């Protein structure tokens, strides 16, 4: 139907149809008379999966023969979403499967909606890992993603009476056709026990054993016949476990609880024992697998054949675990072992918020991992000896840099452990990486400046354009060809079309079609009625105070109050959509969701407003929903307080898909504006330096309330019960926080934000000039492909060359 | 290679080879370079499974079109063993797969050993259910087996220092290629809650819900293209379950514990709540499935289209559950509902031992199943009104017949509930069925004589001859053809060969080959050295006092003592093998295992004995081990105290496979001896009437000890520490039980048993006359095919005609 979706040859279509029918009969054990749409989805998934296996076996055989340097990406989160369409895209099978299913009397898009998301992450950090796997395969790198196969991923969010409710995400209920269990490569992991010292070194004894069983999922590169592996570990009790009789069998559950559920708290550290067990479990099983594979090729060459990338500090125990194995089991001396470890490991930081840093109580490590605690103390002593030699007499530096934090409870700072034991430390956007060198890791940067790098985040143009926005991918390919899909810098060629009346019309037409599709989806699956001619104003991301969904709320109420003040005045109509999940224990985030729905309840039912303003809370935001709403957006809200969002990646998805951005100079927004030109971006608010000035002086929210009459009115409406008539004091916590305890200075950016929003509305009144600015954004989005990002990791950290060359089919 | 194993045609062999290679590549995702024998087993299992699915789909479609009366066999145990060879046998694929695998460079028998047993039962009752499924499919009946998919079946038994140790039977670890999950047919099951009375009847409210997810396994008939279904339910928590957050997800395990593990106690009732939940879970989900299927065809015709067979009282809650559904949900009046229930249900009793009867505490039923308790009280009241009208003034009869037992704790007698609510009640051998009418159910037989039947047990000649003893099946088919495999009465034709010198030699040759094979197996997999020329004397069955493994022990010690007394005298050499699992909490049974190994330790290492006597404990006895040892046996020990073993089925397996029987006149032994002729059986000991005489008088074990010098010596050896030098008093519990508290009168049968054993040894000295008696046994074993048994259930209980006609291929 459309060219970017590949060929639908007679031979291929014929073959797909017969393999579909074979799977329905032999694999699903059904006939057409009893088959449900879910059966049809599974028959299709099994048919596409068959096309992967040949390439998967030959890719792994090739790595064994050629023995390249292997890249191991360790993460506690992989936010993968759905797999069927992504696989078809990367294999050039989409049009053929479309034709084949059409001829069988089926609608492929309907079958695609049956697949569950693999929701094994919370947000940006987990989705980054997923984009990275796609780019590593597309660039022909010998890479493996290693994680945990959670039985329950991120909860499903229901909204009841305006409140978030959590439901278990039982994503494996119907089975997962993409994974292959490998019970034959099961490995033991040890917990508790104690340390014995012999003549021949330390011994970790009397441990409890949990088994780690791997499940492998294929990761196809874009049309290069490369298929890499994501290996996820599942916890199993050993068979002599606890072995009155009935209870001993039932208690096997205790061991298997390790892989049961993803912790849903992002940007807030809780020192729970089960989380620590999860972190060690992934690290210990992964490291045995790495060493196994290396021996099947003397540890001097270890860093030449192995790179380990730590996705934040979550897998930081890799550092002392690798030391444990090299020293205790392989009997290398300390200094040699340490050299190998440092050259092998590298660490990526994703936040500067203090409450998000992992600082584990020593008493936990003492009981659970007694040998690792001893290794950490020894690392600390030797590291601080170096600091002392470089900065003699600087006793406070020693306290600041220690891996051991003194106090009420002693803790281990995992970020300090990661810097000490890695040859490279990177932030995730230029501004973030600079803040690391100047503030939180300043001491470490002074000691070892060579370690610190930047690697600005990116997104995969496969999932985030071709898959989710085929209409836009097509009008682009018509002018410039198909090469941009794996070389996104080619989008620059589109600047020579900014005055092309045909292109302008095509860009605007694709956006309108996207909005109609999404406007209909809202009514079908959620029974809500929106005007598709309105400006689609969207903020989708996890709910946190720093992301300032509340500032968005203040603008919405301002617009409503202005309308009620002058009802017969013209305003540009808007549909304001906000979505995202809150962490189950985060009270303020749950209150913000309730406020948004409460505003909707008032605004959406005021007859004087008409269809000039609508406020929609988008329920259960997740990867598959993102693929729908992002192509439909006109305005992307990226309004975190300057200095708080390390990079952002949602921002990049919106830029690629033809939305304009309103945002602060924070995270990757700075580089986006630099690429597109500041004239083509809606920048507002305090810069980082302005925030610091305000902190030195002292932030007084009262000053703003006193001097801005429009802001005062809103606060009075909130306090008095305007948005909660039956429960007048419902929002008192929100008002109190805003007035007296606001870490993120919502009031301070209010005036400039409202002013900037007026400028957005002004441009939207001129469709032709709106679209020309859109083209300037899409055309300059090339830097933000994760192919660029991964190529920089490869060259500057891992020491390997990317390859765009195909393997034989 | 051998004719009974079918054809190996060029076309078939070619096809099997290519489908094997396809499964290895696409299903297992391996090449030949990395494949292990387990991979090869799975590729073969998937290849054979493909041949079932066509017939499975068309069998079930046929039942929908023709709408026959459906038979539902409810059991908490299905002791299935391995599936691969059984499937090949029933599909006539064995020789072809043998050829195909040979040509691929593989040994099929080696791959067969990789499959795990489906150990979802304890012993005779569970294995009977498995033989029954095979016979129902072979006789073309529209039958479904319904049970629980336990994650852990009967424990694996290890012997450590002579003691039994239990290990979890993690049989699903590598996957089960035979089952198909059907998450689409998931059904809710309710627990706890309370009863409300409305104007329109009772309502069961405020319940906790557990989901029941079915898994279907194919059951192929013997070469008739019929494939029936065994549907096993798995427990799942609902997704809003318990829905701080982390714990609520982890607590889902509580619900899912219902299907976690098989209770390993046979013949001893424990009133554990988890067991009650298991019993209701299977009944509630099964009954919804039955009704669903019936509606897709007015409840008057219900008994015309449905039969429910209760395998003991374990699924007895079907009776009040069916009443609950018909009265509370369908709104039938009580009397009509009861008529339907009685005509639908039938009950099979498997034991007379008082401690095995299910008598559930009323307080358990009150809390867990409040509505069912009310229904049971109402059933009881109406039943006792009938007893009172038939036997006016007989107040003690009313107490004896009540479903409610009075006392310390009130209990419900589930056996009484089953008789009241079933149109048929049967025992499992003629002697057992007579004991039911004369003793434990005498009152019920007087009230409703028409309800009571006999159905003597049987075994399937597919698993228990063709599969496990192909050598014997072949020499038989050479003379009389292949028809006997589904018409076992044809074995009578073999009587005309009792004087045939060629046949005599062939029968003896097959036995010797079986013994050599098993003698080698013992050395390979268990490093133990036996003489294959010795008489193989075997007792394999679950360990219980009533089965009298201890009497066997007394004989063994007698033989050892006689040898030591006159070392240079000739005796017929024996290998005495005893095997079977003990229930984890049964102390005496665990002591008996230790005694057997302790005797072995002394006997097997006495240089004066030589290889004239060996005592072997066969570890981890289970279905796959039975298939090995039974064809190797010369002597079958069936020596329960008269009146205690309801039928036995192991006895029948040994008779079919060319062992002679030493046994009491108990259970089916009586009918076996009647079929073969008493001259061709080694019968000894008290009859039932002799046991009763002894009970009236009072059993005094001292009298035997005082009057039998050989018995006194053994007891003195046991007490003094002869068999436990380092632990002289180890066996004091055993001696005390024998001397003062022996319910099963071991001493009373001792003299006659030893005498009878001398007669066995005498016949074994004359190989030709031994074999002629063997032929007379095999020739008269036809009555004990489960095809005969199932045909009687069909005609006399279920009201359906068996059919040997094929479905189209
Ligand atoms: O800080 C935690 N979890 C985080 C931290 C940062 N991030 C984001 C921030 C965003 F700027 C960036 O674009 C994205 C990819 O780099 O990472 C995120 O998604 N989860 C955390 C995790 C577990 C426990 C406690 C805190
Ligand atoms: O009595 C119980 N469990 C039994 C009872 C009898 N049986 C056997 C006895 C045997 F004679 C017969 O051949 C075979 C088939 O009919 O059944 C058996 O294998 N389990 C029981 C079960 C659960 C809890 C408590 C007791």
Q: Is A240 on the interface with B (CB under 8 A)?
A: yes
> Residue holding tokens 């009861």?
B338
Minimum-distance CB partner of B29 among A56, A241, A260: A56
Q: Is the CB of A412 under 6 A from ligand 1?
A: no
Q: Where are the alpha helices (DSSP H) in B657-697?
A: 669-676, 688-697
In short, whether B266's Cβ falls inside 6 Å of ligand 2 is: yes
| CB atoms A180 and B29 under 8 Å | yes
Alpha-carbon distance of B306 to B287, in angstroms, equals: 11
How many C-beta atoms surround the C-beta of residue B687 within 10 A? Answer: 16
Residue B634 per-residue DSSP state: S
CA distance A51 to A39: 19
Domain ranges of chain A: 1-458+786-809, 459-785
Which ligand lies nearest to the CA atom of residue B427 in the structure?
A: 2
Query: A30 at the B interface (CB within 8 A)?
Result: yes
Deposited experimental method: X-ray
CA distance B706 to B700: 11
Q: State the Cα–Cα distance between residues A666 and A688, nearest whole angstrom.
A: 8
Q: How many CB pairs under 8 A join A and B?
A: 103
Dihedral (CA of A783, A785, A788, A789) sign: positive
* End-to-end alpha carbon distance in chain B: 25
CATH class of the domain at A459-785: alpha beta
Instruction: Give catalytic status of residue A350 as yes or no.
Output: yes
Sheet holding A613-618, edge to edge: A613-618, A574-579, A535-540, A635-638, A660-663, A682-683
Chain B residue numbers touching A53 (CB-CB < 8 A)? 25-26, 29
Residue B78 in contact with partner chain A when CB distance is under 8 A: no
Residue A517 annotated in active site: no
d(CA B780, CA B788): 14
The vertex-A104 CA angle with A98 and A108, nearest 5°, equals 35
Q: How far is A302 from chain B (nearest CA, A)?
A: 25
Query: Which DSSP category does A117 fall into?
Result: P
Directed axis angle between helix B549-565 and helix B587-603, to 10°?
A: 20
Measured CA to CA, the distance from residue B266 to residue B124 in angstroms comes to: 10
Inspect the interface and report whether the beta carbons of B585 and A245 lie closer than 8 Å: yes
- Per the CB < 8 A criterion, the answer to whether A228 and A221 are in contact is yes
Is A564 noted as a catalytic residue in this protein? Answer: no
B112: tokens are 């067969």
Inspect the interface and report whether the beta carbons of B249 and A241 lie closer than 8 Å.
no
For ligand 1, atom 7, the nearest C-alpha belongs to A125
Dmax (CA) for chain A in angstroms is 90
Q: Select the residue from A24, A28, A29, A234 to test the B interface by mutation, using most B Cβ atoms within 10 A.
A: A29
How remote is the C-alpha of B539 from its chain's centroid?
A: 16
* Among candidate residues A516, A537, A498, the one with its CA nearest the CA of residue A769: A498
Nearest residue by C-alpha to atom 6 in ligand 1: A350
The token duo for B442 is 């005498």
Atom of ligand 1 nearest to the CA of A128: 15
Residues from chain A contacting residue B237 (CB–CB below 8 Å)? 168
Residue by residue, DSSP assigns B100-134 as HHHHTT--HHHHHTTSPPEEES-SHHHHHHHHHHH
Residue B194 per-residue DSSP state: E
CA A764 to chain centre: 31
- Inter-residue contact B121 to B79 (CB < 8 Å): yes
| CB-based contact A593:A615 (threshold 8 Å) | no
Cα–Cα distance for residue pair A426/A312, rounded to 1 Å? 10
Cβ proximity of A683 and A559 under 8 Å:
no
Domains B1-458+786-809 and B459-785 equal at CATH topology level: yes
For residues B766 and B759, give the distance between their C-alpha atoms in angstroms, rounded to a whole number. Answer: 12
Q: From the CB of B350, is ligand 2 less than 6 Å away?
A: yes
* Resolution of the model in angstroms: 2.0
**Catalytic-role residue among A542, A574, A581, A622:** A542
**Which ligand 2 atom sits closest to the C-alpha of B128?**
15
Q: Do A261 and B274 touch (CB under 8 A)?
A: no
Give contacts of B252 with chain A, Cβ < 8 Å.
Answer: 168
Tell me if the domain spanning A1-458+786-809 has CATH number 3.40.50.300. no
Ligand nearest the Cα of residue A649 is 1
Residues of A in contact with B236 (CB under 8 A): 173
Q: Which of B:149-178 have CB within 8 Å of A?
A: 152, 155-156, 165-168, 170, 173-175
Contact A257 B250 (CB under 8 A): yes
A32: tokens are 């057409």
Residues from chain B contacting residue A249 (CB–CB below 8 Å): 152, 168, 260-261
Q: Which of B124, B264, B428, B455 maximizes ligand 2 atoms within 8 Å of its Cβ, making it the mutation to test the pocket?
A: B124
Q: Do A53 and B241 touch (CB under 8 A)?
A: no
Which ligand number lies closest to the CA of residue A415? 1
- Residues forming beta bridges with residue B203, ordered by sequence position: B196
Which bound ligand lies closest to the C-alpha atom of B123?
A: 2
Whole-number Å distance between alpha carbons of A505 and A514: 14
Q: How far is the CA of A353 from the centre of ligand 1 (A)?
A: 10
Cβ of B346 closer than 6 Å to ligand 2, yes or no, is: no
Q: Closest Cα partner for B631 from B475, B457, B754, B790?
A: B475
Residues 580-599 of chain B with CB under 8 A from chain A are 584-585
The string of DSSP codes covering A214-246 is EEEEEEE-SSS--EEEEEEEEEE--TTTT--HH
DSSP A562-616: HHHHSTTS----EEEEEE----TT-HHHHHHHHHHHHHHHHHTT-TTTTTSEEEE
Chain A nearest-CA distance from B53, in A, is 6
In angstroms, the CA B291 to CA B313 distance is: 21
Q: Are A793 and A455 in contact (CB under 8 A)?
A: yes
A421 contacts A341 by C-beta, under 8 angstroms: yes
Cα–Cα distance for residue pair A575/A532, rounded to 1 Å: 9
Interface of B with A in 189-228 (CB under 8 A): none
Distance CA A380, CA A370 (A): 16
Query: CA B225, CA B55: separation in Å to the nearest integer?
Result: 6
Q: Which secondary-structure segment (H or E) carries B166?
A: strand B163-167
- The H or E element containing residue B46 is helix B37-66
Ligand 2 close to Cβ of residue B217 (< 6 A)? no
Minimal C-alpha gap between A13 and chain B (Å): 20
| Eight-class DSSP state of B594 | H
Cα(A280)–Cα(A358) distance, integer angstroms: 14
Cβ of B243 within 8 Å of Cβ of A166? The answer is yes
Residues of B with catalytic roles: 350, 541-542, 547, 649, 653
CB contact under 8 A, B152 and A36: no
Q: Looking at residue A780, what DSSP letter applies?
A: T
Partners of residue A231 on adjacent β-strands: A146, A216
Binding-site residues of B for AMP: 31, 64, 292-297
Substitution target from A55, A249, A587 for chain B, most B beta carbons within 10 A: A249
* Closest residue to A53, CB basis, from B26, B241, B261: B26
């Amino acid at each position: 139907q459309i060219s970017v979706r590949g060929l639908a040859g007679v031979e291929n279509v014929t073959e797909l149809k017969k393999n579909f029918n074979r799977h329905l009969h032999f694999t699903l054990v059904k006939d057409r008379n009893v088959a449900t749409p879910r059966d049809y989805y599974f028959a299709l998934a099994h048919t596409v999966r068959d096309h992967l296996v040949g390439r998967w076996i030959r890719t792994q055989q090739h790595y064994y023969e050629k023995d390249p340097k292997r890249i191991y990406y360790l993460s506690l989160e992989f936010y993968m979403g759905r797999t069927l369409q992504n696989t078809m895209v990367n294999l050039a099978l989409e049009n053929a499967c479309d034709e084949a299913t059409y001829q069988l009397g089926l609608d492929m898009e309907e079958l695609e909606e049956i697949e569950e998301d693999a929701g094994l992450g919370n947000g940006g950090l987990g989705r980054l890992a997923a984009c990275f796997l796609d780019s590593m395969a597309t660039l022909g790198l010998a890479a493996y993603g290693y994680g945990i196969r959670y039985e329950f991923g991120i909860f499903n969010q229901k909204i009841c009476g305006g409140w978030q409710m959590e439901e278990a995400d039982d994503w494996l209920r119907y089975g997962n056709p993409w994974e292959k269990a490998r019970p034959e490569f099961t490995l033991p992991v040890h917990f508790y026990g104690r340390v014995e010292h012999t003549s021949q070194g330390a011994k970790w004894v009397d441990t409890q054993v949990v088994l780690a069983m791997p499940y492998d999922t294929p990761v196809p590169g874009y049309r290069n016949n490369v298929v890499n592996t994501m290996r996820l570990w599942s916890a199993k009790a050993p068979n002599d476990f606890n072995l009155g009789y009935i209870q001993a069998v039932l208690d096997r559950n205790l061991a298997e609880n390790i892989s049961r559920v993803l912790y849903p708290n992002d940007n807030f550290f809780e020192g729970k024992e089960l989380r620590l067990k999860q972190e060690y479990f992934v690290v210990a099983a992964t490291l045995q697998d790495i060493i196994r594979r290396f021996k099947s090729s003397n540890f001097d060459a270890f860093p030449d054949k192995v790179a380990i990338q730590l996705n934040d500090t979550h897998p930081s125990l890799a550092i002392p675990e690798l030391m444990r194995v090299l020293v205790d089991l392989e009997r290398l001396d300390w200094d040699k072992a340490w050299e190998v470890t440092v050259k092998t490991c590298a660490y990526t930081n994703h936040t500067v918020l203090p409450e998000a840093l992992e600082r584990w109580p020593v008493h936990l490590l003492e009981t659970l991992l007694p040998r690792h605690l001893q290794i950490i103390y020894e690392i600390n002593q030797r590291f601080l000896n170096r600091v002392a030699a470089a900065f003699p007499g600087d006793v406070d530096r020693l306290r600041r840099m220690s891996l051991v934090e003194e106090g009420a409870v002693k803790r281990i700072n995992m970020a300090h452990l990661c810097i000490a034991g890695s040859h490279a430390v990177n932030g995730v956007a230029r501004i973030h990486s600079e803040i690391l060198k100047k503030t939180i890791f300043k001491d470490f940067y002074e000691l070892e400046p060579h370690k610190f790098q930047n690697k600005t985040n990116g997104i995969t143009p496969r999932r985030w354009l071709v898959l989710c926005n085929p209409g836009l991918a097509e009008i682009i390919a018509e002018r410039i060809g198909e090469e941009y899909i794996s070389d996104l810098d080619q989008l620059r060629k589109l600047l020579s079309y900014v005055d092309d009346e045909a292109f302008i019309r095509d860009v605007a037409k694709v956006k309108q079609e996207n909005k109609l599709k999404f406007a209909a989806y809202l009514e079908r699956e959620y029974k809500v009625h929106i005007n598709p001619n309105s400006l689609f104003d969207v903020q989708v991301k996890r709910i946190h105070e720093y992301k300032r969904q509340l500032l968005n709320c203040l603008h919405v109420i301002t617009l409503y109050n202005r309308i009620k003040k002058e009802p017969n005045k013209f305003v540009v109509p808007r549909t304001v959509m906000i979505g995202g999940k809150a962490a189950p224990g985060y009270h303020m985030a749950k209150m913000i969701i309730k406020l948004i729905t409460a505003i909707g309840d008032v605004v959406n039912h005021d007859p004087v407003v008409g269809d000039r303003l609508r406020v929609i809370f988008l329920e259960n935001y997740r990867v598959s929903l993102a693929e729908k709403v992002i192509p439909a957006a006109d305005l992307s809200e990226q309004i975190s307080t300057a200095g708080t969002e390390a990079s952002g990646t949602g921002n990049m998805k919106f830029m690629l898909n033809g939305a304009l951005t309103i945002g602060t100079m924070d995270g990757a927004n700075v580089e986006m504006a630099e690429e597109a030109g500041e004239e083509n971006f809606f920048i507002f608010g305090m810069r980082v330096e302005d925030v610091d000035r305000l902190d030195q002086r002292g932030y007084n929210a009262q000053e703003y309330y006193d001097r801005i009459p429009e802001l005062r009115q809103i606060i009075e409406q909130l306090s008095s019960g305007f948005f909660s008539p039956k429960q007048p004091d419902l929002f008192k916590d929100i008002v109190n926080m805003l007035m007296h305890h606001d870490r993120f200075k919502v009031f301070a950016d209010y005036e400039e934000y409202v002013k900037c929003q007026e400028r957005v509305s002004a441009l939207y009144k001129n469709p032709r000039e709106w679209t020309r600015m859109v083209i300037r954004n899409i055309a300059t989005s090339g830097k933000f492909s994760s192919d660029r990002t991964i190529a920089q990791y490869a060259r500057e950290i891992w020491g390997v060359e990317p390859s765009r060359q195909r393997l034989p089919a």
